[PDB]
Write a protein that binds this ligand. Structure first.
Ligand SMILES: [K+]
Ligand SMILES: [Mg+2]
Ligand SMILES: [Mg+2]
Ligand SMILES: [Mg+2]
Ligand SMILES: [Mg+2]
Ligand SMILES: [Mg+2]
Ligand SMILES: [Mg+2]
Ligand SMILES: [Mg+2]
Ligand SMILES: [Mg+2]
Ligand SMILES: [Mg+2]
Ligand SMILES: [Mg+2]
Ligand SMILES: [Mg+2]
Ligand SMILES: [Mg+2]
Lengths: 50, 60, 107, 63, 61, 354, 153
RNA sequence: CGCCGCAGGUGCAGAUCUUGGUGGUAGUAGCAAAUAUUCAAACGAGAACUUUGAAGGCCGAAGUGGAGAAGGGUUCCAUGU
């Protein structure tokens, strides 16, 4: 909602920063074995815990 | 416009800008961004210009 | 010639008879387009917006029985198109349809 | 090309609905260049954007 | 031109605090340059100044 | 269809005027620079003469825009080019024995005469300049003679690059990677026809192949370092911008809008410097260049202690032999090298004057 | 790459190929069988006529529920349709094959489709929602298509 | 891997067996609740569906309008794909 506590807003802030694509240079690293961010979350498919 | 520490209040922002930029400020407006960082709108005193201060700060 | 323009009257009533209420006006413009392709032999038929108003003047189901149109076959020599000829059909307002023939109209 | 933004801004500037905003169908390119409310105001002054009049609902029959 | 821990230990509190202040104003300038594009040379100096600040502070402590 | 080429004698005469005026400004500058001077003063002076002389010339026509086609640019022992500091920036004081690179351009009726020359300051009478730097300037001037001789319809743009690489390797140096010369036409300084200097795979695959044509101007540029040929930036302000007339964006700030209008009024499409304004210019330029309204010309730095040279001059291409309109004061008596040309074809092209 | 049925001599032959194409395999297989053995000019008109519904492709194997048409009598059949998307995809591949033929410098007025093959491509998954809180597959059926054109006249 | 001994979590068609994969069904059922679309133009490789204009309709202020609480958490806004 519009009325939110600081903890809830701070919690939403962290979930927002970590929902980004992996940097491209990562695949160039030796022994990368990572293709894409498997922890991507869309607001409509899956809802946050809180 | 500055990005400040989330624990700093308006009084602390006012003193911080005053000493390390040698300017006088009129008021400080504060919000916390959706990314979690705190943003401060620091309005300078009328006798100070925000354009040359930004020029010597280096954010032109 | 091939840049000929002619003026016709189309029996919309005949060509719309039997069509449902919500489809009479949309079908009237399809029959008008079909009519133009037949007499002018051009697949590309452009219908003037004023003619589109006249067909839709009395709503979607009470289409006018008769409409007086003017078929202008013109060159498409303006861009690379599969058709070098196109027909522009326009609206000709009339007060009566009695004794109205198909007439060749000059420039 | 696409003028969804311009019709929204013209509606806000003219203080009318998007029903009454008229964008010149011939001068689409100039309107497409307007990305600011100031640019929309200049286009309104220049006649490329017009507030259409209210649809007539007469009371003569009732009177 | 870097600062080491060994040569910091002979200094007294006044210039150690002076040394720390000069590094802090330089790091803040580097952070300004990071936001306004800056250069790769200035971006790579952010870590160098940060560890220099840590180096001065640990000697004071 | 309405473009103006060299088919007209008036075009010919005002090209000659641009060449003469650029030559006289550079001749004044090479003498005026001495030990203990300031590059800010040099840049201000170089613009100051050009303004008055272009104003007094064509006094009977006050409808055409004429003046600076490229701002005065100084590069001294550590900078490549596009260097022109403002008053607020820390100035550079000329020491003894520095080699400096001068770039300056003039325009008449939108047509460009743009010249760059490297020379050493404060040369004593009877002395010889000796060192590793003594070969790079001489190789650049040999590139100048090579380009002058070989610029001709039918000679490909991929031949001048290999000739310059060949002479650079003959002098055991290399040019800076990825520098572009251009074909210069009316109100254009960044023409589609591009010549490339010391390319690599990416620039070669992005480069075009073309055949030299009649009735056109080239700005052939040699720009050679004595180290590795690589350059970057050292966190210094960019001072040269040019308005791109292709793309447009609606500027939402009054300062940027006024700055852009002033740029259109004075330096409509030609490169300028932020010195020509300052307080509000430095703020307007960031919003203008964010949306690619102004192409920047960044300062490029070589490694510390390296030496880099440059020559460049507008050459017209006429059917019976190209001519040079802007020339720099380089003398072989006061400047020699410890190594010469070991290529027979290079000797053949350098010994043949145009 | 490995084609099935290499040409009798790969000097008067050109090849074209596509993988994971978003056309129904069943419609494309029937359309490929119709143009097999055709001259390249005949196949191009025929595929254009299918788009205009002036000529049909007979549905011989994957014919369940396929309706009857008058144009199916040109073929010795009764059931036919006008797969527009299959016609476009084969038209694009025929253009690619003809361009390959020009690259090898063999004339394109004598090309004949001697080999054409439609293969199943890996299915792609979507979802559909059913009556009592049930999820059902909504699979796509893409196809790999290859063809070989040879000169004969 | 053969031979002499030794030791087993040692042999599958089934168990409405477990996990995975694939068919016929089948180009089938179906994409039918709430009246409705049409003409011209633009961009574009490509237009029934995008945008603009014109026309015909609908919601009809107990709205298919304008704003909030709870809940969602960036879905908001530009540009691009
Ligand atoms: K049928
Ligand atoms: Mg939900
Ligand atoms: Mg607050
Ligand atoms: Mg069946
Ligand atoms: Mg369902
Ligand atoms: Mg359910
Ligand atoms: Mg067992
Ligand atoms: Mg089994
Ligand atoms: Mg069905
Ligand atoms: Mg149905
Ligand atoms: Mg109603
Ligand atoms: Mg509402
Ligand atoms: Mg949105």
């Amino acid at each position: 909602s519009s009325h939110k506590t600081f903890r809830i807003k701070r919690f939403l802030a962290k979930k927002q920063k970590q929902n980004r694509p992996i940097p491209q240079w990562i695949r160039m690293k030796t022994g990368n074995k990572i293709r894409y961010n498997s922890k991507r979350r869309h607001w409509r498919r899956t809802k946050l815990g809180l | 416009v500055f990005i400040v520490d989330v624990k700093a209040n308006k009084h602390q922002i006012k003193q911080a800008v005053k000493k390390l930029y040698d300017i006088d400020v009129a008021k400080v407006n504060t919000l916390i961004r959706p990314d979690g960082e705190k943003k401060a709108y620091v309005r300078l005193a009328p006798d100070y210009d925000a354009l040359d201060v930004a020029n010597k700060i280096g954010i032109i | 010639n091939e840049v000929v323009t002619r003026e016709y009257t189309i029996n919309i009533h005949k060509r719309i008879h039997g069509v449902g209420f919500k489809k009479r006006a949309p079908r009237a413009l399809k029959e008008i387009r079909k009519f133009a392709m037949k007499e002018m032999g051009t697949p590309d038929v452009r219908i003037d917006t004023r003619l589109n108003k006249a067909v839709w003047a009395k709503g979607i189901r009470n289409v006018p029985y008769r409409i007086r149109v003017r078929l202008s076959r013109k060159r498409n020599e303006d861009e690379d198109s599969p058709n070098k000829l196109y027909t522009l059909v326009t609206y000709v307002p009339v007060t009566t349809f009695k004794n109205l023939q198909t007439v060749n109209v000059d420039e | 090309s696409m003028l969804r933004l311009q019709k929204r801004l013209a509606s806000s500037v003219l203080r009318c609905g998007k029903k009454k905003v008229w964008l010149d169908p011939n001068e689409t390119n100039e309107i497409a260049n307007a990305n600011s409310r100031q640019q929309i105001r200049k286009l309104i002054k220049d006649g490329l954007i017009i507030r259409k009049p209210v649809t007539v609902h007469s009371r003569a029959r009732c009177r | 031109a870097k600062i080491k821990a060994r040569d910091l230990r002979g200094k007294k509190k006044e210039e150690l605090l002076k040394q720390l202040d000069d590094l802090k104003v330089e790091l803040s300038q580097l952070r300004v340059a990071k936001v306004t594009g800056g250069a790769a040379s200035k971006l790579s100096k952010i870590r160098v100044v940060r560890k220099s600040i840590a180096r001065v502070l640990t000697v004071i402590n | 269809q309405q473009e103006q080429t060299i088919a007209e004698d008036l075009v010919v005469t005002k090209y000659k005027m641009g060449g003469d005026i650029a030559n006289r400004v550079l001749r004044s500058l090479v003498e005026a620079s001495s030990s203990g001077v300031s590059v800010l003063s040099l840049c201000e002076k170089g613009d100051a003469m050009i303004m008055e002389e272009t104003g007094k010339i064509f006094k009977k026509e006050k409808e055409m825009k004429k003046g600076i086609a490229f701002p005065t640019s100084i590069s001294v022992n550590n900078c490549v080019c596009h260097f022109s500091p403002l008053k607020s920036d820390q100035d550079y004081i000329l020491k003894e024995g520095d080699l400096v690179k001068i770039d300056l351009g003039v325009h008449v009726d939108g047509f460009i005469a743009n010249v760059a020359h490297t020379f050493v300051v404060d040369v004593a009478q009877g002395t010889q300049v000796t060192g590793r730097k003594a070969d790079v300037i001489k190789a650049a001037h040999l590139c100048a003679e090579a380009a002058l001789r070989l610029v001709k319809p039918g000679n490909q743009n991929t031949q001048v690059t290999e000739a310059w690489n060949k002479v650079a390797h003959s002098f055991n140096c290399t040019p800076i990677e990825g520098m572009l010369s251009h074909q210069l036409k009316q109100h254009v300084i960044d023409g589609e026809k591009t010549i490339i200097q010391n390319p690599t795979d990416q620039q070669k695959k992005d480069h075009e192949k073309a055949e030299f044509e009649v009735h056109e101007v080239y700005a052939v540029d040699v720009l050679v370092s004595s180290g590795e040929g690589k350059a970057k930036d050292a966190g210094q302000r960019t001072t040269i911008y040019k308005r791109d007339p292709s793309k447009q964006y609606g500027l939402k700030m009054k300062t940027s809008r006024a700055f852009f209008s002033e740029v259109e009024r004075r330096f409509d499409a030609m490169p300028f410097t932020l010195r020509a304004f300052e307080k509000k210019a430095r703020m307007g330029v960031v919003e203008c260049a964010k949306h690619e309204l102004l192409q920047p010309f960044n300062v490029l730095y070589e490694k510390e202690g390296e030496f880099v040279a440059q020559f460049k001059f507008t050459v017209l291409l006429m059917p019976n032999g190209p001519m040079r309109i802007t020339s720099g004061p380089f003398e072989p008596d006061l400047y020699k090298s410890e190594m010469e040309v070991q290529d027979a074809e290079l000797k053949a092209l350098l010994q043949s004057s145009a | 790459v490995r084609y099935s049925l290499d040409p009798e001599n790969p000097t008067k032959s050109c090849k074209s190929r596509g993988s994971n194409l978003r056309v129904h395999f069943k419609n494309t297989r029937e359309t490929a069988q119709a143009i097999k053995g055709m001259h390249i000019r005949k196949a191009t008109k025929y595929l254009k006529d299918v788009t205009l519904q002036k000529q049909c492709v007979p549905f011989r194997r994957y014919n369940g529920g396929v309706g009857r048409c008058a144009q199916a009598k040109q073929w010795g059949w009764t059931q036919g349709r006008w797969p527009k998307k299959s016609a476009e995809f084969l038209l694009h591949m025929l253009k690619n094959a003809e361009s390959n033929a020009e690259l090898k410098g063999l004339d394109v007025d004598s090309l004949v489709i001697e080999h054409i093959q439609v293969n199943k491509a890996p299915k792609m998954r979507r979802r559909t929602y059913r009556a009592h809180g049930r999820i059902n597959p909504y699979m796509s059926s893409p196809c790999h298509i290859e063809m070989i054109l040879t000169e004969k006249e």
